[PDB]
Enzyme design. Structure first.
Site, PDB file in Angstrom:
ATOM      1  N   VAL A 147      64.343  53.867   3.794  1.00  0.00           N
ATOM      2  CA  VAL A 147      65.762  53.492   4.059  1.00  0.00           C
ATOM      3  C   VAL A 147      66.628  54.041   2.906  1.00  0.00           C
ATOM      4  CG1 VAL A 147      67.326  51.478   4.155  1.00  0.00           C
ATOM      5  CG2 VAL A 147      65.275  51.532   5.576  1.00  0.00           C
ATOM      6  N   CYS A 148      66.214  53.788   1.661  1.00  0.00           N
ATOM      7  CA  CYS A 148      66.934  54.180   0.420  1.00  0.00           C
ATOM      8  C   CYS A 148      67.129  55.695   0.378  1.00  0.00           C
ATOM      9  CB  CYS A 148      66.185  53.703  -0.812  1.00  0.00           C
ATOM     10  SG  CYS A 148      66.065  51.897  -0.866  1.00  0.00           S
TER      11      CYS A 148
END
Ligand SMILES: [Cl-]
Ligand SMILES: [Cl-]
Lengths: 201, 201
Positions: free
Chosen positions: B43-44
Site C-alpha cells: 500500500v505504502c
C-alpha cells in the site's frame, strides 16, 4: 484512549427517532457515528444535510448512520427543520441527545470525530476534523467499501483505489496453494511483496 | 497524546535527500509528514508513488512533503528504485530514516498517520488509516486548500467544499461593520448562524 480495533462502546440514549441501544440498533450492519460539538452550527448543518442526501448510498452498503450532539432531543428536532429547509433534504437518521455526557465519555470526545463500526462492533476508522473544514463524504463511502472488501478477502486497497479497482494480496498471506485457491483470476508479482490481483468480488 | 493545535515537534534526522531539520527545512511553507511502519510494504509503495506524482500539486500550494520509516537511508534508496520502477514515477521528496526512533517517539507513533503542519509549525490535521486501506490524495489537497483559506479569511468550508466553492462566515465573527469590511461580495443569512458568502480570495 479509544482506538482502532477496540470495541465501539454500547450505550442507550434518547434520539430524534427514539431510544437507541447502539449494538442492538446496528444489529448486523456497519455503523457510522458522526459527532457534532453543538446544534445550530454551520458546517455541521451542511454535513447532516449531505448525510441525509446519501441515505440510499449507505443503505446499499448495509451501513446505518447516527449523529451525536450534547443538546436535547427537542433541540435536534428544531435543528432538523433548519437542515431540511436550508439544505433542501429530509433528515432520515437518528441524532443522539447526550445531555448527561454518557456517550461523550465512552467515545473520549474545536474538533469533531467520526467512528466507522463493523458488524462485530469493532472501531475500524476514527477521523477527527477541525471546526474550520467540512468533510468530503465520497471519502467515507470509499473507506467503507475498502473496509468491507478487506474483511471478506485477503487484500488491501492501494492509493486512489475505488470500488472495482485492482487490489494487493495482503503481505501476511504467503501459502501458494491458498493464494491459487483464493485468487482464480491470478496475480502479477511486479515485486515479490507487491502482488496485484483483480478485485476478487 | 500529540494533538491538533500543538506544535509539530522539531527533529534532525537522516533522509534519502540528506539531513532534515524539520522547522528549518519547512521554513515558510506548509508541511505534510506521512508515516510508513516499514519499507517494502505494498500500500505504502502505491502511496509514495502517488505522492511523487502530485509534486506539482503540493508545490503550487507551497506545501513541502516528507515520508518517515524506521528503516535506514540505504534501504529507502533501494525502495525508491522499487517505487520508481513499479509506480512509473520519480520519488522527489525526502524519506526520513528513524533507526533510533527519535521522530517516532516525538509524533507518538497496523496503522499509519499523516500530519499536516502550518507555517507556524502547528499540527492542523492528524489522519490515521489502517494497513488494509490506501489514502485518497485528492482529500489531503482539498483539506490543505480549506486550511490555507480559513487561516487567511474568517470563513469555514462547508461539506463537499472544493477550492472556489461558496463558504460560511465563521460563527465567532458577529461585528456587522467588520463583516461588511471583510466581505464586499456580501452574504446570505439563510439562517442567522448560517451566513453563506462567496470564497473571498
Ligand atoms: Cl481509481
Ligand atoms: Cl463542491
Amino acid at each position: 484512549m479509544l482506538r482502532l480495533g477496540d470495541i465501539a462502546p454500547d450505550f442507550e440514549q434518547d434520539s430524534s427517532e427514539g431510544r437507541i441501544r447502539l449494538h442492538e440498533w446496528l444489529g448486523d450492519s456497519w455503523g457510522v457515528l458522526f459527532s457534532h460539538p453543538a446544534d445550530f452550527t454551520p458546517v455541521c448543518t451542511t454535513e447532516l444535510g449531505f448525510t441525509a442526501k446519501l441515505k440510499d448510498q449507505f443503505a446499499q452498503r448495509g451501513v446505518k448512520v447516527l449523529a451525536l450532539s450534547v443538546d436535547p432531543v427537542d433541540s435536534h428536532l428544531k435543528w432538523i427543520d433548519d437542515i431540511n429547509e436550508t439544505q433542501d433534504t429530509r433528515v432520515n437518521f437518528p441524532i443522539i441527545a447526550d445531555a448527561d455526557r454518557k456517550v461523550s465519555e465512552l467515545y473520549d470526545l474545536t474538533v469533531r470525530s467520526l467512528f466507522i463500526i463493523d458488524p462485530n462492533k469493532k472501531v475500524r476508522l476514527i477521523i477527527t476534523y477541525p471546526a474550520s473544514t467540512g468533510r468530503n463524504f465520497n471519502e467515507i463511502l470509499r473507506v467503507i467499501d475498502s473496509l468491507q472488501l478487506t474483511d471478506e478477502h485477503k487484500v488491501a486497497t492501494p492509493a486512489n483505489w475505488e470500488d472495482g479497482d485492482e487490489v494487493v494480496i495482503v503481505p501476511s498471506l504467503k501459502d501458494e496453494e491458498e493464494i491459487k485457491r483464493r485468487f482464480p483470476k491470478g496475480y502479477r508479482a511486479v515485486k515479490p511483496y507487491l502482488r496485484l490481483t483483480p478485485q476478487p468480488n
